[PDB]
Write a protein that binds this ligand. Structure first.
Ligand SMILES: C[C@@H]1CN(CC(=O)N2CC(C)(C)c3ncc(Cc4ccccc4)cc32)[C@@H](C(=O)N2CCOCC2)C[NH2+]1
Ligand code: NA
Ligand SMILES: [Zn+2]
Length: 104
């Protein structure tokens, strides 16, 4: 509902540290791995498996075990500068092509 942050500055700098993001999950019952989530820049909101990226502020939910944090981050928040710093544009293009092709 809010626009995604495409600047090089994090929307939520309180969640910029991996350890800070890790704390937000607590006991995590969900199919997708919390450390893998925190590495993809995601922190938990405390309602179901709702996560937000610390940098773009981009929010995701209803994590199937087939869904990957970095892939979902790229699918839904392609303009995220954190995503770009960590993964690079070669990775990001693959994800886009793969999912844009996945539709068939
Ligand atoms: C891990 C994947 C994510 N999918 C996309 C998803 O989660 N998106 C896409 C988008 C950007 C339109 C969206 N906007 C709002 C919410 C809620 C929200 C609000 C603040 C914080 C976190 C979550 C979620 C969401 C899931 C997906 O395909 N979904 C179909 C649509 O409804 C959500 C599930 C499947 N799992
Ligand atoms: Na929790
Ligand atoms: Zn992001």
């Amino acid at each position: 509902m809010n626009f995604p942050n495409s600047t090089n500055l994090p929307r939520n700098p309180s969640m910029a540290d991996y350890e800070a993001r890790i704390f937000t999950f607590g006991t995590w019952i969900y199919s997708v791995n919390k450390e893998q989530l925190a590495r993809a820049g995601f922190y938990a909101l405390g309602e179901g498996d709702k996560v937000k990226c610390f940098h773009c502020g981009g929010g995701l939910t209803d994590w199937k075990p087939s869904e990957d944090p970095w892939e979902q981050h790229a699918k839904w928040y392609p303009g995220c500068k954190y995503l770009l710093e960590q993964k690079g544009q070669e990775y990001i293009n693959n994800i886009h092509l793969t999912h844009s092709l996945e539709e068939c």
